[PDB]
Amino acid sequence: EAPLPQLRAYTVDASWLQPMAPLQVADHTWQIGTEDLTALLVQTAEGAVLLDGGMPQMAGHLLDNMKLRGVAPQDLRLILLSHAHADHAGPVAELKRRTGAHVAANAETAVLLARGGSNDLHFGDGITYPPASADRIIMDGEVVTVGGIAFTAHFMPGHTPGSTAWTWTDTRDGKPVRIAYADSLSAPGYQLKGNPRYPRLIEDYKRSFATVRALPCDLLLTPHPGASNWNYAVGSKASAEALTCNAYADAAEKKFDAQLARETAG
Amino acid sequence: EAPLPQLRAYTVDASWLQPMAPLQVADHTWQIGTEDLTALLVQTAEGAVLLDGGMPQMAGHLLDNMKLRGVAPQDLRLILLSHAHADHAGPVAELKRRTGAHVAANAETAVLLARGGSNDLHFGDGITYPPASADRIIMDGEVVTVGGIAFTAHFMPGHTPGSTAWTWTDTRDGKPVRIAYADSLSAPGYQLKGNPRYPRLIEDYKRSFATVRALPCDLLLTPHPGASNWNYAVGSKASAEALTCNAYADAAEKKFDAQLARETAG
Amino acid sequence: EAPLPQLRAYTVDASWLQPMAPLQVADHTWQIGTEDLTALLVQTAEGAVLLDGGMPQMAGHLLDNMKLRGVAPQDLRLILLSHAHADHAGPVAELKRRTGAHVAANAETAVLLARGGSNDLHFGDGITYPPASADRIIMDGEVVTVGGIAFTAHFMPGHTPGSTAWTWTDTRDGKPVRIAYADSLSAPGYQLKGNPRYPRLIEDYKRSFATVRALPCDLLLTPHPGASNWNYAVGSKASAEALTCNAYADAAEKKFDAQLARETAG
Amino acid sequence: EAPLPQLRAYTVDASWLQPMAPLQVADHTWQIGTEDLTALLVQTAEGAVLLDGGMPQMAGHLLDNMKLRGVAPQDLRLILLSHAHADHAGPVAELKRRTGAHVAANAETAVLLARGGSNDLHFGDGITYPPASADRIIMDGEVVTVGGIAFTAHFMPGHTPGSTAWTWTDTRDGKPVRIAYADSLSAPGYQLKGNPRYPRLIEDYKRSFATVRALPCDLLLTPHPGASNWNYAVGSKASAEALTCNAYADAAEKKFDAQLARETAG
Numbered sequence A, B, C, D: 001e002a003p004l005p006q007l008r009a010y011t012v013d014a015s016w017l018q019p020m021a022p023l024q025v026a027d028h029t030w031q032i033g034t035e036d037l038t039a040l041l042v043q044t045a046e047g048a049v050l051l052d053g054g055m056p057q058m059a060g061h062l063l064d065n066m067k068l069r070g071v072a073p074q075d076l077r078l079i080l081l082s083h084a085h086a087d088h089a090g091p092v093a094e095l096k097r098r099t100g101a102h103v104a105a106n107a108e109t110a111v112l113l114a115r116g117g118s119n120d121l122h123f124g125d126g127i128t129y130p131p132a133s134a135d136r137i138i139m140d141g142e143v144v145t146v147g148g149i150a151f152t153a154h155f156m157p158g159h160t161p162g163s164t165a166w167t168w169t170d171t172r173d174g175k176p177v178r179i180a181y182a183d184s185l186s187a188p189g190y191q192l193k194g195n196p197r198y199p200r201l202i203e204d205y206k207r208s209f210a211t212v213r214a215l216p217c218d219l220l221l222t223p224h225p226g227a228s229n230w231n232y233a234v235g236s237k238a239s240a241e242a243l244t245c246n247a248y249a250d251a252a253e254k255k256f257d258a259q260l261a262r263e264t265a266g
Ligand SMILES: OC[C@H]1O[C@@](CO)(O[C@H]2O[C@H](CO)[C@@H](O)[C@H](O)[C@H]2O)[C@@H](O)[C@@H]1O
Pocket: A178, A213, A214, A215, A216, A217, A218, A246
């Protein structure tokens, strides 16, 4: 009688899809995504690095903003990721096809990216995107260097098994600024306790809060800017209310502890 | 001002998603998909073969019908495909996870399946599904045998580069019936002439019409039953109006020639 | 003048390639590899599991011993691995082609297996084997069940990033025996300190010694039987001198500490 | 009693491993491989293309010759292949890691490259190399353009299913020269007739001879220079005795016909 349900698209708040002009974060580092999704362009003498790309439909916008910054498609050398969900790695496959970029990621992120976010530990097949391959597998603490800028990977599993914080030192008019691009610490709708697909989930989150607290962190950014209290829409004041890494980890742990207590109740 | 567009789901006619009970095609062969999408179960002494699975959301229905036929999940040994579009290979990844099945397919089908139908030559990223890996690569004319039933692959590129017809001989109360499961010969919205992503498209279709004409073909079935004039909803009369392979290829070539003439006009 | 060097084969001690008849370890568990490489067959009512396969050239021998145990190729349901080096995962690709088996492994093991052991963190391309794909990705502590026998994964990174101990409870004439198949803890020729390809190597080994100490462990086996003092060549006395998990971890840590001190010296 | 055999390395004639300085073929095109294996560097205003790399151990030599030509590792934009055997695609994985290059290849070549030449239709696992992934899948007749130089793919299956001829137009002091890099047409030790792994092998070779005859072909080069009568070791006279595409196809077909007759005899 009833047919099987139609496929449902992954739809998001309009602000996550609202294009913005490039916003300078430090001397070499620019936010080039949307008002509510981070995509960081780091420009060096020997090419550019992109950290995250946002949603699948953002590929053209990212290339447009790269061109505004003077980065031709072939000048993009490397793509790094916070984690391989559709709202952060969405356009990676298309960006690889349209640029000279390689992708570097840890093994967990590589296997999730290669299945386009399908068979997610918590989302199943509900939130997917075009698959892409990682060209370089990185280990915890490994340094990736482009044009002399060194990016250090800090694994912080929990939100995904492959969740990664990336740190690098830029300058603000020549003076060092230690940037920490810390991954999400949310657990949206997750089963936290006794999860057969992620048995050590709680232990991983708890260690990840400590990892984030200890990051070198003059300036924190996050894949969802609201998580670190950034306001990309207000330009020069965008960073004014930004959290420290310590405060971001503390807020995330308090939310996590409350969610765990509610799960025990329900 | 305007945000980027939301992602759009691949939605289809309700009849493509309308479950049906198993319909016997020959002694060992059953249609177990929906009223308007073919999924053929061939049952042998040494396990079962599935030819196509339909849409991604059909995985549970297929397993239900397998159980009605006496095929436990671990009894499914092999998945074969007509072509790797979402409406025929949709549930392959999930079926592999939930059964003991391997997938056998040609290289073109394997590479399209492995990217979940993304970066399609004609559809781009508009019609995708969870990626799956082929476990065995097959060549044109290669025979795959399960439980003594021999399935022969006949490449018929055009609708996709990897489009394949599968033939086998079943029985009807012990008497031989040469079954031809011929792939689609449609070109829905395709640019046929001077296509930079498929320069020899017209030559491939034209050869594929000839391939289909020559198939051993007592009984023709097609991924979309309407293409061969099957009527799955009427049970015992389902095959009554079915086309021959010759008539199917002729109708497809006439449609193709008309579409090519219209493309030249527009 | 001098040509580039010829490729060099991965050659091993003859005892690693010396076939042996199946040796019973417990009611359902058999050593079916060679005198000096472990390959464990666990036989259940609903099919068999293979833990490791040894060297690439052992595939036929493994299938022979499976047949002696009553396991037809299609009865092999699952392959599990200690780690994805050529002397333990060597024949996995061929076994998958010749049996109905899937492979389950963590993400690190999956990415190393998929490149056939090439670009190894320590061996480069010197020790490789035919690539294979993991069909199921498992997380730390995840339970995989076949025929009612539950196998629990315990990650113990160091020898490879994906190194895994597998535990299960068998019986000895109906009485429970907790088997621990603990991975290698060696670091043959490895740079341990300040390794840019594995920055947290020492921390991972140190945690892995503790993981092995805590395993449920009535009977310890290891990929190289000599590491746990097994003597496969003497049949019924093969397990007589076997180490406990505690003693295996202690011996490995003492060796590791000495090697680290020598590396600091040299 | 007897242990299983040791693994055997793929060893080749010394001349295949004999490094040579870059040899100019046309204004933009250089032979940069060894005396007996072709590796063509095409240098454009917008980066370089490499067609084949030879044996796995040639990676460093190729990078050295690129540097002599003024091509830094990051200037290599694209790798194209004749076919994915160890003596032509051997160093592709390492070159991708050490350069900015992507690989473009047809689906058949991509699936063979991704398993490192293992499970070869004729060689089994005897001739393998580190696996690499194709970043772009190309179709027959598709044009790939770098720095304004257009490379056209011409499929010529037989030696491998994915065998490809690549054509482009260079200049000799400004005057057009149509270069044809035609793949191997040998069948070394192959079973040609009734091959269950390649049922249409003879038909594919026969069509491939015709494909090679029709190539735009002012100057023919081949993966093994001896096949087209090149003499890389004599510098300026290297091309003097080179065959036409017509003569290369004719010689290959005569050899093929004789081998087929001998196979029928034996
Ligand atoms: O790398 C040390 C550096 O990090 C900062 C924050 O940028 O301090 C963080 O790290 C310290 C050691 O891990 C912690 O004591 C501190 O709580 C944490 O914020 C800088 O203060 C310090 O120079």
